[model samples]
Target chain A: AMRIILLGAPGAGKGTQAQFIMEKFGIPQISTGDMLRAAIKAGTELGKQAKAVIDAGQLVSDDIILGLIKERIAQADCEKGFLLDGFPRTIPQADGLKEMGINVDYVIEFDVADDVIVERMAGRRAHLPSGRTYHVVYNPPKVEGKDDVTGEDLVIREDDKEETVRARLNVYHTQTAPLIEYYGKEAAAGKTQYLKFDGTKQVSEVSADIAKALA
Target chain B: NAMRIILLGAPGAGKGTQAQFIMEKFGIPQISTGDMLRAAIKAGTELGKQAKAVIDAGQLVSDDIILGLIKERIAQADCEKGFLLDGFPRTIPQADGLKEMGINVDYVIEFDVADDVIVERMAGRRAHLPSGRTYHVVYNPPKVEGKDDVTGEDLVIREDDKEETVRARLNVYHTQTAPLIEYYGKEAAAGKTQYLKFDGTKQVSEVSADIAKALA
Candidate 1:
C-alpha cells in the first residue's frame, strides 16, 4: 500500500491535486477536516467531545485529532492505501503519527507565495448551496454576481473578505510559516521526501508535475 | 499466536505418524491432504468428484487441484489455532502459492528415511483394522500365522503391499519431494528459525521427544 500525505496552505490547490492523485492511485482521499465534520454530523462520542471543545472556543487536542485519523485509516476502504489531505499540520502531529507506526510514503507541499494566496483568497466567491465557486479576477462567472453553473447569486465568504484575508495571512506568517522550516529540516535529514511545488502555476500543470514526481 | 508448521517427508517416511504426535503435543489440529481427500471422497463432494477419478485410476492428483482443496480446507474455523500441513507443496510453484496466500509456517520438519528400509518394512506390513495395530511378517508377526491374536481376525495385505510397488513409490518420492526440501531449506537459512530435519529411523517416542525439544 502506498500511503501519501498532501500538505499545503488554504489556497495552494491542495484539494485539486488531492482529487487527481486519488483518481490516479485508486486510493481513498482522507481529509482530516472533512472527516471531523462528518464525525460531528454523525454525533459520535468523539464528535461530541470535539463540539464541546469548539464551543469553548479552544482548539481540539492533538490526541483527539490523532484518534480520529487513526480510526479513519483503519476502515476497510483504506486496505489498499490512502491519501491524506490537510493533516499533520504541525511537526508534533507528524512525529505522533510516526510513533504510531503510520508511515507516509510521500509528503507533497504546494508552495505559493503569501501575496499570491492573498490575491487568490481576495477574488474568491462561492454560491454555498450548490458549491459553485469562482474567482473574480481569474475565473469570473458568465453572469456578474452569479454562479455560472447554478445561476445562483455568488457571495464572498466572511473568511474570504479582504480584511479577513490579510489578517489570516498575518496569522499564517506568525504560526504556520514555521512548518516549512520543519518539513525542510526533516527532508534534509532524510526522514521524509518533502517536495515543494509551484502552486502559482496552472492547477492541472502543477498536478501533472506532482504525479510525475510521485511516480 | 499459534505456531505455523509444515510436515515434510518422502513417501512412507512417516510424516502422518509425526503429525499426530506434534498435533497432540501442541494442541493444534493436523491438516493432512490425504485426510481431506478421504473426507471429500466419503462425502462425495465436488473435490471428491474430481479426486475420485484420479485415485481410482491410481494416478497422482494434479498440483493445482490439490492446492485448491488445501486452500478451501485451511480456511475452516478449526484452523484458527494453527495447523500442521501434511502432504502438501510437493513442488516449488505450490510453495510459492503458499507464500502468496500468506500461510506462515513457523516450522518445517523434514522426516528423513532411507528408501530401501521403507520398501522392505512396508512390503512385509499387515494391519489389524479393528485395533489399528500393524505387524510385519518378517519382523513382528502375529502368534498365529496371518491371524490377529486378540480378535482372531484374518490379517490382510493391501494390493500395493509389494516390494516392487514400494520401490516405485520411493522413486516417485525422490523426484517429487526434493523441491519441497529445497524451498524449506532456503527459508531456514534465511533465519526463519523454524525448519529442521528429523531422522525417522529413531524410535517414535524418541523422535517425538526430539521434536518437542527443538520446539522449545
Candidate 2:
C-alpha cells in the first residue's frame, strides 16, 4: 500500500503524471475536490452542503472539506492506499489530516515555475468524452478545435481560462506554498519523504522521472 | 515525532540507492526484513520463537508473525524518532495489516526504474558497511580492487547480489510489487492528496530536485 500526496500548481502537468501514476501504481487517486463534486452529484448530505456553498459562490470551509475527505477515505477502494491530488490546501487542513488520523507516506510536489505553467496552461484544451486533452501550441489535436477521435468540439474548461488559471496560481502561491514548506520540513527531518520534481520537462520525460524517483 | 516510511520500488529501481541517501541525509536507521529477522533472532523473544522455526525450516515468516515482530521493533526507543522501512508488505494483506497495527505512512515514493537499469545497477554494487559507502564495481570501483579504501577490508559479494539473483528479484518485484502501483494510481486519480512521481533515470541532483518539488 502506497499513500501519496501529489502537489503541483495548475498547469504543472499534475493531471498527466496523475494518470500515469494511477496506471502504474494501480492505486486510487483521491482528489478531495472530485470527491466533493461526486458527493454533490450523488446528492448526499455532505454533497448538499457543498452544493450550497458552490451555489452561493463561496468556498467550502475546512471542516466541510475534511468531512468530505473523511467520507472519501472510508470507501472500499481506499483500503489499500491512495494518491491525493488536491485538498489540504492549508496548514490547518494539513493539521486536519493529522487529526483525522491520515498519515501520508510521500508528499510529491511538481515544481514548475509560474511563467512556465501559465504558458503551458494558455494552450490547453480538452476532448470531453474520451478525456483526451490537447494543448493548442504544444500538442494540438488532429483538427483545429475538434476532437481527433469523436469530432466533438474541444472546449477550454471554465477553470482553465487564462484569468482563472492565473488566479488559481496566485491562490496556490499564497495559500498552499506554506503547506509545501511544512511538508518539506517534515521530509528534511525524515518524518516524511518530501520530494520536488521539476515540472518544466516534457510530459513523458517528467512522468518517467517520477516513476524512477518513487521507485 | 516518529517518522515511519515505506520504501517502494520495483527491483533494481535504485530503491537501495535512495534509501541509502535518505538514511545518510536524515541520520535515520534503515530497517528491512533481514534486519528485523536478525534482531528477532538475537533477542529470542516469543515472536522470535515463531520466526525462528520458520527460518530454521528455510521458509518465509508468515505475515501475522512478521507483523508481530514489526510491532515490537517499532515500540523500541531508537525507533521513536523515525525509521525507513524496506521490504515487507509484499502483498495487499500485509499492507492492510500494517494499517491495522496503526502504522500510518507519511509518504509512499515509488521509484520507477526500468528493469534493465535496475539489473545493471544492482550487478555493480560494492558496499563498505563500516564507512557506509557504496561503490559501483563497474562504474565507480573503490580505490583498491575488491577492498575498502580506508579499512583495507575485503569486499564480500553478497549471495543475493549475484546477477541471477538480481533477475529473480526483478521477477518477484513485477509479480508482487505491481499491485502497489495500481493502488497508488487509483488514489491519485481520485485526488485524495497528492502523488508525485519523479523520473529515476536522471542524475541524482535532478532526482533530488524532483523529490524536493514534489514534496514542496
TM-score of chain B in each prediction: 0.77, 0.73
The DockQ of predicted model 1 stands at 0.00
Clashes of each: 1, 79
In candidate 2, position B158 carries an lDDT of 46
lDDT of each residue in B111-167, candidate 2, tens digit only: 777878876777678765433346678766787878977557666554345566567
Cα lDDT of model 1 overall? Answer: 0.71
Model 1: docking quality category: incorrect
Which 10 residues in a row give candidate 2 chain A its minimum summed lDDT? Answer: A35-44
Per-residue lDDT tens digits for candidate 2, residues A102-124, read 87878988888888876777687
